[PDB]
Amino acid sequence: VRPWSEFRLTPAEAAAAAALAARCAQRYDETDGPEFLLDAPVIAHELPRRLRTFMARARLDAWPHALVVRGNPVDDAALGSTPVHWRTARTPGSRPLSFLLMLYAGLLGDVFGWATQQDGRVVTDVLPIKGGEHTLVSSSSRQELGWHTEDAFSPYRADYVGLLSLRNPDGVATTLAGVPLDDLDERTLDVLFQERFLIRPDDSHLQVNNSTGIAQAADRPEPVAILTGHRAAPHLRVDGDFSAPAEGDEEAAAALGTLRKLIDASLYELVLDQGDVAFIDNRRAVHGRRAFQPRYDGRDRWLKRINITRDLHRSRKAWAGDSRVLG
Ligand SMILES: NC(=[NH2+])NCCC[C@H](N)C(=O)O
Ligand SMILES: O=C(O)CCC(=O)C(=O)O
Ligand SMILES: [Fe+3]
């Protein structure tokens, strides 16, 4: 095999991890509180050793687009109905699973949120919101969520995007694609490495997607490269919807157009069943979500998600209130 690295917890490992998260949910008032934010990486050292070994070695592999952990138990009855909105989605039934995601994430890096996304929460919610079916945000449904680097507009975007599937009864697939190196000619590749492209911020950073900097990003975007790093294993920064060539740059336009078609043709599906966790490498792969028909009956697809950077100090310029919410 697969383009991702997969780990399946044994029942005993899964019980121990869940018990750990339960303990944290008893001792800490909230997942995004400063106390648990600082303690979670240390508490994570108590997770099962086989899981910690996987996370430590897999993060260092050069190939995988995602780290996938399967087999966390989720009791639908204890979980309760899927919320109608992210504002009210911190339900007691989902609380321990949110702490669990935080613990797993603490093995990979430093977690943060965005002041302009779900009220600057660190653990956020992905669920279908009635009326937002044909939008370009993660609460869409009937409209396929086009592939994208998470927060491509920003130089402080996550290195990893964590997704915990609380329920996915219809098996809706997350979509993934890597750099199509096997099909890019060297000239096209060279152009993609140059600062000849524009990236606007996606709609989830707009004021209409929050309760009661981003402006200058979609209005006066600075030219940026789509590919960086090693020619033979580039890092990727693109958004299928919000990317564009520099004004009048027909050679960059042709390179982006080619890249769109190659990623479209190489997109593959990863189904996160209930309890599955995925950490998507936001530098090697773009990700999206297949279109699906929302239910609105209380059992809709529901994910918790979290942004992870290897170095919070790389984003010092963007620290808003504290270091864990970027502006
Ligand atoms: N090309 C795009 N649709 N980009 C935006 C992706 C959705 C974004 N990850 C969100 O949480 O809403
Ligand atoms: O809907 C999914 O499975 C992924 C959503 C997504 O792209 C995100 O919020 O990072
Ligand atoms: Fe995304």
Our answer on whether the CB atom of 165 is closer than 6 Å to any ligand 1 atom is no
For residue 140 and ligand 1, the question of a CB distance below 6 A is answered with no
Task: List the determination method.
Answer: X-ray
Query: How does DSSP assign 81-139, residue by residue?
Result: SPPSSSTT---TTTHHHHHHHHHHHHTT-EEEEETTSGGG-SSEEE---TT-TTSSSTT
Look at residues 165, 68, 161 and name the one whose alpha carbon lies nearest to residue 111: 161
Domains in the chain, please, with CATH?
1-327 (3.60.130.10)
**Which two structure tokens, joined as six digits, stand for 320?**
């808003």
Residue 142 sits at φ, ψ, to 5 deg, of -60, -25
Which of 68, 85, 237, 212 is closest to 147 using CA atoms? 237
Give the span between the Cα atoms of 133 and 138, in whole angstroms. 10
The helix (run of H) or strand (run of E) holding residue 177 is strand 173-178
Distance, in Å, from the CA atom of 160 to the CA atom of 137, rounded to the nearest integer, reads 18
Q: Is the distance from the beta carbon of residue 145 to the nearest atom of ligand 1 less than 6 Å?
A: yes
Tokens 């707009």 belong to residue: 206
> What separation in Å is there between the alpha carbon of 272 and the centre of ligand 3?
14
One DSSP character per residue, 195-228 reads: S-EEEPPPGGGSGGGS---HHHHHHSPPPB-SEE
Nearest-atom index, ligand 2, CA of 280: 10
How is 255-292 classified by DSSP, letter by letter? HHHHHHHHHHHH-EEEE--TT-EEEEETTTEEEEE---
Nearest to residue 45, comparing CAs of 5, 104, 93?
104
Q: One-letter amino acid identity for 180?
A: P
Q: Tell whether 30 is in a known binding site.
A: no
Which residues are within 8 A (CB) of 215 and not within 5 positions of it... i.e. 6 or more apart?
none
Does residue 174 have a known ligand-binding role?
Answer: yes
Task: Identify the three-state secondary structure at position 164.
Answer: strand
- Which residue type sits at 281? D
CB 199 within 8 A of CB 243: yes
How many CB atoms lie under 10 A from the CB of residue 321? 9
Residue 322 DSSP one-character state: S
Strand partners, 293: none
- Expressed in angstroms, the distance from the first to the final Cα of the chain is 40
Q: Which two tokens stand for residue 201?
A: 């911020």
Distance (Å, whole) CA 111 – CA 175: 23
Residue 164 CA to ligand 3 centre (angstroms): 13
Greatest alpha-carbon span in the chain: 59
Q: Residue 235 in contact with residue 286, Cβ under 8 Å?
A: no
Q: What is the DSSP letter of 6?
A: E
**Residue 49 CB contacts under 8 Å (≥ 6 apart), including other chains:** none
d(C-alpha 307, C-alpha 326), whole Å: 11
User: Within its chain, how far is the Cα of 290 from the centroid?
Assistant: 15
Q: Is position 272 annotated in a ligand binding site?
A: no
